[PDB]
Write a protein that binds this ligand. Sequence first.
Ligand code: ANP
Ligand code: ANP
Ligand code: MG
Ligand code: MG
Lengths: 324, 330
Amino acid sequence: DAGDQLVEKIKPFAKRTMRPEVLGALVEIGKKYQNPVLVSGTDGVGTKLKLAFDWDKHDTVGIDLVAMSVNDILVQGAEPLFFLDYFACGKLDVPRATDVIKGIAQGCEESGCALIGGETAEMPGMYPVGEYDLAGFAVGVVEKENVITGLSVGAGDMVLGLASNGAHSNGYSLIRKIIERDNPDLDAEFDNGKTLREAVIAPTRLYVKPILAALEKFTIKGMAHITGGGITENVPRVLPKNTVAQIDAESWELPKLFQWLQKAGNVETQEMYRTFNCGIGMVVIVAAEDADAVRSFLSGQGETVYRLGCIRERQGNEHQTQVA
Amino acid sequence: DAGDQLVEKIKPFAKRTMRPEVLGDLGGFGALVEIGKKYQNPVLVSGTDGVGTKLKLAFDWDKHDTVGIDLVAMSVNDILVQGAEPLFFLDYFACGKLDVPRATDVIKGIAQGCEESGCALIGGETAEMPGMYPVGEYDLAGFAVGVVEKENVITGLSVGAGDMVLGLASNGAHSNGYSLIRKIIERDNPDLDAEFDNGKTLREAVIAPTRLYVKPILAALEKFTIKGMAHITGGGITENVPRVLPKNTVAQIDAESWELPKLFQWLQKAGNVETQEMYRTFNCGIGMVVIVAAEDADAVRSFLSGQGETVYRLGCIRERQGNEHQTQVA
Ligand SMILES: Nc1ncnc2c1ncn2[C@@H]1O[C@H](COP(=O)(O)OP(=O)(O)NP(=O)(O)O)[C@@H](O)[C@H]1O
Ligand SMILES: Nc1ncnc2c1ncn2[C@@H]1O[C@H](COP(=O)(O)OP(=O)(O)NP(=O)(O)O)[C@@H](O)[C@H]1O
Ligand SMILES: [Mg+2]
Ligand SMILES: [Mg+2]
């Protein structure tokens, strides 16, 4: 069987993601946790899969898949533990599927979680030749007293920003409409020694290792993963009803990729802040007394940290995240 | 947004699946589940699956309120065989254009399958991919997580010659072999609305949702020790039962110990399928296989039957002879 051929080829990829907790697929919880709470989430890649088909580039969308879930569970303080993926298609292409799952496993390695199982469904006729669908599922563990809830966020807290690797996994319907409209030279140098194509399909950044190392030394009051809805619709999810996150627009330069998308797309700036991450992949809220020490740590871990702004008292039905 | 509309419509359905372990409700970056020292050495058991080609019939007949039960059973029944209590569930729903009434119907069945299994439906994802799916069509993926004490993990390693093999009856073909069911139906055009069996139309028999074995099996585990279990999915009876059998044992099934249900009788005739090929393709009326000690077989059969199940004494375990196949039906 094709799927049986695929199962053997991916055994090496998954074997490198294993953890001592991995014993259906059985996972033990480390005695590290006294009162363990499980944090889980599911997601797909979105319309970025369309560029992966069109460009025949399948070895990175698996990193996008994993990041979408492990980064989501990360905001509660959870350490990612294990991951499962579901892969659906019409007729199985073992070399191309192997590439897809190889990237998944690679993203699991970077997140410190084990890829312990999955499912490859062949539905002949439901998918066009060459196309497929991906779903991922992540589970992490956090101590009950260490759950990051955002309830202590109050006026005076400083808003930090972790830089993103590009558009990540959101806003690609617009990126695709633009590219089909301009037919731009996708293989020309675009930024930081990467071609425009390389910048567009760049895999989503994982924040797991530096954020977890940070939590060993500091208290993080809240976090927001910047995905669907951009900055302004995602940060208010951890903010108390009475607080506003005020973002100074000049605290970070808009990366070149988003500068191109707004120009070509002719998008009002406030629509950009609610559509693309605009270079901000993860928002970390901390106490002002900790803001400097955390920024140095996260920068020393390899991240690019900005001081986006601070938390203030809300005035009425005021929007809870304003960039200006 | 359509998806924001769908999340609101399904929140009541998920709220009826909740358990005390679930912290918070639908909506939020992550879904929180506490375990509690109710478990001393807790082990998580998880699985993922889709519905398979049965969705094609769900499209054709415009019956979407039960394939979500099929989705749940495919995963919760899998983790059940290791002795795990299903705890929580997440679903992924992909389509081209979101049809909120139909999506509401699909997820409503998911919640119903979760309610019947005792697991909470705590989260999910609705992806709109315009152009990847024809109008009206969608894809389902589910993820189930259960808990078991490390010492109670059921592995089948103590299965030995002399143990009795019980069989739990199925509701039909469940979630496997449906590409073939569709080829047959599209060729013969049989009256799908005629009475066929047990006062149900043939259509009702074909699209019947997969049976959930969670509540009776977990209740059984309180009173008895189960040596092994098999959920009968792809590969039928003969390819799934040997998964829990030690290298040196064989499960011999007397074919006359249960009647092939009418639905499979029609599929064999219309498909012109060798009988030993049916045992490797369809569940043939056996949804779950339970192996127990011979001294417990009488009480276990009685208990599971009193819980609402149809129990057969499929056969017994014997010593394997060479490269002998580990499950033979005769
Ligand atoms: N896309 C995938 N990604 C990661 N692991 C996979 C994937 N597909 C299969 N596996 C694993 O390889 C093995 C293949 O088993 P599989 O053929 O999928 O049957 P099953 O999962 O037991 N249930 P079923 O889908 O009903 O046949 C399983 O252990 C999987 O966990
Ligand atoms: N099919 C579904 N079934 C159950 N719950 C769902 C489903 N779809 C969405 N939800 C829940 O409603 C909310 C949907 O918002 P969503 O945009 O999917 O959040 P997210 O984790 O940030 N993923 P994304 O924004 O796409 O990167 C989540 O909290 C889900 O738990
Ligand atoms: Mg997400
Ligand atoms: Mg969604």
